[PDB]
Amino acid sequence: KRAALIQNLRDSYTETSSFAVIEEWAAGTLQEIEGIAKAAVEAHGTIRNSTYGRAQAEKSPEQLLGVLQRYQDLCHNVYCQAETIRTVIAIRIPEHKEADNLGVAVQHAVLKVIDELEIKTLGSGEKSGSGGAPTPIGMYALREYLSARSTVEDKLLGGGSQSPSLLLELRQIDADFMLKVELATTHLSTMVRAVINAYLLNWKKLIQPRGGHLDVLYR
Amino acid sequence: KRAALIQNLRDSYTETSSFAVIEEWAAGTLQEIEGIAKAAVEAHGTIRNSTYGRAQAEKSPEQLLGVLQRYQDLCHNVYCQAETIRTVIAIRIPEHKEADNLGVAVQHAVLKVIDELEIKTLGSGEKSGSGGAPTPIGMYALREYLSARSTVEDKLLGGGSQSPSLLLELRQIDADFMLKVELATTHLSTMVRAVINAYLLNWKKLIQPRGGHLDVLYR
Amino acid sequence: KRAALIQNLRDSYTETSSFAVIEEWAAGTLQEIEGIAKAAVEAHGTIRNSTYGRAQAEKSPEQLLGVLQRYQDLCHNVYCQAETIRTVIAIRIPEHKEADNLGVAVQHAVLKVIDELEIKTLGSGEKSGSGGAPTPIGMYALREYLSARSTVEDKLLGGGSQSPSLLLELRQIDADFMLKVELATTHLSTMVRAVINAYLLNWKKLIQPRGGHLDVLYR
Amino acid sequence: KRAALIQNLRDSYTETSSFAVIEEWAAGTLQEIEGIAKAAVEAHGTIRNSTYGRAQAEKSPEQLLGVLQRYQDLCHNVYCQAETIRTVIAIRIPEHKEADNLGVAVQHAVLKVIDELEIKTLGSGEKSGSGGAPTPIGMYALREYLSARSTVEDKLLGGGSQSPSLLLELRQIDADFMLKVELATTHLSTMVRAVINAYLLNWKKLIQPRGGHLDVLYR
Amino acid sequence: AYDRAITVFSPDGRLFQVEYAREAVKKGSTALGMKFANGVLLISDKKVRSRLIEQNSIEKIQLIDDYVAAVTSGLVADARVLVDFARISAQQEKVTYGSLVNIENLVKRVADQMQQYTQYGGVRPYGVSLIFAGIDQIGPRLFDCDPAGTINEYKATAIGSGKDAVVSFLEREYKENLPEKEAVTLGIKALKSSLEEGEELKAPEIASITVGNKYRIYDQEEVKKFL
Amino acid sequence: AYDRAITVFSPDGRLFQVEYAREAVKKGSTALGMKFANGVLLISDKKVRSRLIEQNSIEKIQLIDDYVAAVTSGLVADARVLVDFARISAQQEKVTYGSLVNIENLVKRVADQMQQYTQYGGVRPYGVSLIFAGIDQIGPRLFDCDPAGTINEYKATAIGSGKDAVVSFLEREYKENLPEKEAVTLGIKALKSSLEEGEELKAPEIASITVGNKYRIYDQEEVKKFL
Amino acid sequence: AYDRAITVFSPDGRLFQVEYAREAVKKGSTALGMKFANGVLLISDKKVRSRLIEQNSIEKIQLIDDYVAAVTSGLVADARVLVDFARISAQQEKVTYGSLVNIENLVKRVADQMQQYTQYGGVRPYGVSLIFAGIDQIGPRLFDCDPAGTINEYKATAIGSGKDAVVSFLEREYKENLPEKEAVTLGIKALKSSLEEGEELKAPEIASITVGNKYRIYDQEEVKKFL
Amino acid sequence: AYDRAITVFSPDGRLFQVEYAREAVKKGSTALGMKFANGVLLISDKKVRSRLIEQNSIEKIQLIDDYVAAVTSGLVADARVLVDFARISAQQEKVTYGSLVNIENLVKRVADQMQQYTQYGGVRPYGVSLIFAGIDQIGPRLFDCDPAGTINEYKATAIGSGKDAVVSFLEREYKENLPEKEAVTLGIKALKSSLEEGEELKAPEIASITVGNKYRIYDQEEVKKFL
Amino acid sequence: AYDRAITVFSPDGRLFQVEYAREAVKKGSTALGMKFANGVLLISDKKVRSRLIEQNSIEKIQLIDDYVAAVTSGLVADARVLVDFARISAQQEKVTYGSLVNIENLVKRVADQMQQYTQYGGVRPYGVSLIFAGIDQIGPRLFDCDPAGTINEYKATAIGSGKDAVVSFLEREYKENLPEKEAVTLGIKALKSSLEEGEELKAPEIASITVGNKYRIYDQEEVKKFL
């Protein structure tokens, strides 16, 4: 029976699951974002107070690898927790009608905001194809780091190259990608708090997209 | 005769076929997505608790190949089962009229949702051309894995390269593509449950796009 | 005389020609699509139950070449038969007016659907430029197969390369392109049956875009 | 005097010039398209019943060169003849007004259709940038043929390469570009007959975009 | 973008809203009639419905007098309002002239009423066509009044979904002054040749007048003869 | 884009706004009635509501006379305004003719009133259907009046959300001239077979007349018998 | 974007809705007339239709008096309403002045009526042009009244789909004071030269008056002479 | 796109504009009432406002007679216009029948007035619900009149923002024929259980009648007892 | 987006719809007039049309009295309705005051009539300008009334498509109190200098009054002198 399957979906992913995700975001996710931001702050200055040579092209900076990996695991957790709220809202989108879509538009708006969250949580290289906002790094932070660094390390190690701007470009890879991490954590703080606001003001229309007491009017 | 051919299409792909697809999605597909997600969870940590060398660039990780192949076969099955519902709805799109399109708009909306499902089930590399949501991997998961891995394996094996960021980039290929698999399974869970909701609430207007009792009004 | 040339077009490409195309689609084209789909099913498993070496990079798989060539000839025939219906509808688009376009909109809708058919029947590589649905292979199936395979065969034959992921990438080229063939045949089945529905419900407004008995009203 | 220059344009490119172009399209252009289509049919099978080696990478197929050159000269003639009708319509676009644009919209519609004709008559490589219909080859047929063939001939001649998929890719260049020629001739037949329909139904509003007998109403 | 108001013409000069009321007529069931040697008849197709329905109130043919009668096709609500207006106008004509002298301006009353609503905004037309038929001081009459109001005197017509096929038949088969029975069977063949394949003609209501006589409606078993 | 005004037809020739009022009727609870051997009854489903509600004012069945009664389905506001107009028109008919001679043009007053609002802009139709039933000079009557105004004399019908299922049942089970009790139990079975699975038929209001008698409403325990 | 209301001008200052009613006239069949030596005539093309149609009611020419007559082209509904208003207006002029003294303000009444609807919103114009012709106290008259209302006294004109070609012919061929027969044959040649190639002129209705005489309509065999 | 006019239904058949007036009622403060052993009362919540306001003119309860009274919720402007119309209709009923005989068609006057504005374009409905209560020739009465006009006789109800919670309480707690004091305290508990957490019930106005007596409003210190 | 209604101003504060009626005037042919030593004249250009047209009814100059006359430019329908209103208002002024005492409030009647339609929605203005001229108790008068209604007394003006060029000529050439003939020839030169190159001035209608005399229109051969 069809109503049994619909009820089987909705009892499985319910409002307390979505609000538990919102509680976890409102406390723990935000301080973890802030901790990774402060780690990026400290690592950026650790790179900044240094002058490099061939020896820094011979070993990868494990501290920077750890900061990138922490930000990557954070983005994975935030994406999956956002997909939880996406499923909770999307399994309560009602029958398609040409009217009565007041609370349906609330659902589409909140899903649009969560779309923005996860489109700036999912990863991307410099695509050079979009005219909108370039996405702060996302999932492929350590991937893009090691690729862009390994190109310069190949050019420096080989005889090697004699360009000093290549060596300072390696230095700028290090400092610039930590800078991108802290930019990304600031914007993710903004976006997560926006989504928390949107859910906590709209949850009634998110769960009940339309209220029916038609037996008062239609008898 | 034309009505014979229309009836031949509709009796061939009918509502019980589409709802059998919806039943298979509501039970088996979802637990298979979850099983591949847990396998990606375990394989990601198996990669994570390791440090690589030249020997890991000499043999392909058959466990990761199996996880990618399971996700690929899942995406193939979900695509074909979605195309079943697409055909069931699309062979019942009525005569094109400028009015009376209330249930026709329901059909276009549900086909639009199934479009989203299969556009994020079909595969794509990093296209770097779109401003919308970058598609989680899709059909070409094992293809993109082996291509991006074989480039780094060529660079590491050859004399070989001396870049340690290239070796850790190989490690990040392994961990990052399992991470992309588990991201993709979470989003496919969300999208499949959204399509199940849409069909189970809209099936009446999907099969009968307009109801006609005009002989009550027009005699 | 102008009416002579218009009548010369319409008597040449008429409704019985378009409906003969629809009859050929409703019987023979669909079972040929299904036969190529089952051949892709069998060839995919024939690839799947195998482990490759250097010897499989020395000879092209003539069975897979035959499956790709059958799908290519099918797409050519479906494109030309669709262009027949396109010409039949397009030589009956009436004088451009700002009103009376009820049946004209039916013609534009059916031409739009046939546009979708032939835009997913015509071929394309992975363009990485569009945000819409990536087109299943089309006309250039055997071309894209032999190009993407010949790149890996050059890399494997030359001394040759030592990447095992390159060898499994060749294997994945074989299995993945047969998989793309069977995906494409399923979607072409869906699209062909949609166009058959659209013609068989709309043919009256496709041939007569407007009916004129104005002498009843205007005398 | 200005009216003298306008009359000098319109007497130079007039309706009998445009209708002479339409007569030439209605007879000779269509049978020339069909003849090049049948030549592509025969050359495609001539390629198909063959197996290639190094010797076929040492001489260009002059028959295929002739078929491509015939299609190219046809596209040049069809483009220039379409530009004739474009000029005939465009030198009769009246004074820009916010109303009275009934026949002006007819002119914009017919110019839009001729735009479609010449945008699928003008040439293009595989651009991989558009989401619309990929253009069948156009003017650069022999150019794209010789470029894509000369790349594979360089790879085969040099020592030479040992990839058999490269040799069959050369074979597929030959068969596939003749196939593209016959696809393109079928679509050009459709488009030319659509433009012939559009002109022969709309020529009165194309030449007189508005009729003025205002002295009956305004005296 | 012009077929939204009753009061707007088009680049050709067409009133689409009136034409869509005429399309609303086309969804009603076929009804025909013709005059013959001293009198006129009417035939009306009825696809037989719910046996719960009292058959007295599904008759498309209606008596507007003992000496004028009509049949409708289109919207059933507007249809009944129209046959009411025809009855009331027959009574007003009969009280101002002592008798319904000529059927023609009964149908003029109905026609002007139906025409007026094809001209003023804030009102929609009637989606009904009517076929009047009777005997007057002149003799057998037969009109049709369409949604725009246009009336025309015929010797045979139909209305409804079959109308083109029935008038196509009568256009090549009808011969005037048939004795009543032969006329009826010709009209039955006319009604038969308007259905689609597989459809069997059920029992249609048929009624007639002769000069100097009143109305009568053939009951179902006198109808059953000509099946 | 045409279903916004009451006065605009469609490319098929449809009045969608009238059909949407007919859809507004469909959301009301099922109510049926039929005539039998000397008289007519009415049955009306009521899903039992708040015990704070005085039961005198949730009766879908309403007495428009001692000898005419009706039942509604649709908008409750328009429903009550309509049963008021039925009562007032019954009194006007009774004062101009000495008695309610025929039920038919009481329902014509109601029908013309409901029809008029399906034609003029700046007015919406009534989203209510009404089933009239009573005894006149002729005998047992049974009508239904829909939002467009269309009236039809039946031997059995329903209105409301069940209407198709109930008329489907009665279409294959109803036999005329049942003695009152047997008729009522047939109508109860009709009302039963329109609910969805799991729903238990609660107590419905039912009322009847016989020829020469007045109205009576079966009280809840005479109703309770046929459960 | 301005051709949607009757009450809105354009950047040139044009009333398109009025012009589209004038385009609606252009879809009607050609009808011409001229004055001659003591009298006026009228000619009207008719592509012969269904033999089921009583020929008495397809006459585009209509007698508004024994001494005024007219012919229409355009919408048939508006056409008949207009010839009705012409008749009633002739009767009102005749009762207030004892006789239809001059045809001119019969046509002024028709003209002012047709003009008024080209000015107020919520009303559409008449899509009909009318050609009046008769004898008064002054003599032979010949007018044309268009949708906007504009009247003009002519010595010859046409209306309808041919109008430009017929007035083009008469503009270079007509000579005044022809004896009736010669005039008619000139007008027949005028009507002939407005058809398209291959079309054969069927039998057109033609009627005339002379000074001091009443109306007569040439019957089909007196018409058949000039073929 | 259909919730813009009062005169347009929807694909379900809904009048959204009427429902939005019903939503405008929902923003008013809660007011309840019930009948008991020989009489009826009314309770109305008031969140105490500016001490500059004369308390005489913030009373949601208003005397429409010595023997009918009511309470509103919604727009305060429409609320006052409505209680004015209730008073004037009470006076008209009292002058035509000598006394307010039954409270029911006072509320019918108010109900028909409020319904009429839910039907005609160019008018919006009243965004107010009213609860009438009093003693007549019959006894204790208690109605509620909503924006669409719908009236229902109850034994207990509320209106306003709490309405669902209060009718939910009374739906499982109310027992009829309580002596006045016990009834009032039950209604106070009902009003209490509709507030949100942390909100303390301030002093609400409460008034009652018994059979044969006039009105009285409990002053603030008789109210202060039941806190 | 503001030039669609007659009742909406613009960010500058302009009434475009009125200005578009003024543009509709500009499409009419040029007509001028001036006063001189004891009297006023009028000149009106006419590009000679169909010889089938009776010349009596293409005169842009029209007699509104024996002692007031005018000329129009713009829409011919509105033009004729306006000269009708001028005539009727002249008769009303003459019956209430015994004689047309002063021309000024004849033109005030016409002006207030034309102004009123530039203010109310659902009405369009008149697309005509009028030039009045005559003799009163005061003497020679000469006005122009535009679509907005604005009237101004001049000593010379034009209207129509030439108006700017003619008033430009008269603005530097006109000298008052010319004897009639010299005045006419000056006005002919004015009318000449408004045409375009290659255009030959055909025969224009010209008419005049002197103080104490009635009207006269120069016939075509007295006009032919000044060519």
From TrEMBL, chains A, B, C, D:
What are the alphabetically sorted keywords of the record?
Proteasome
**InterPro entries in the cross-refs:** PA28_C, PA28_C_sf, Proteasome_activ_sf
What are the transmembrane regions?
A: none
Q: Name one GO biological process term.
A: proteolysis
Taken from the record, one Pfam family name reads: PA28_C
Q: Looking at the UniProt record for this protein, which Gene Ontology cellular component terms does it annotate, in alphabetical order?
A: proteasome activator complex
The Proteasome activator PA28 C-terminal domain is annotated at 60-120
Q: Which Gene3D superfamilies match?
A: Proteasome activator pa28, C-terminal domain
| Name of the molecule in the record | Proteasome activator protein PA26
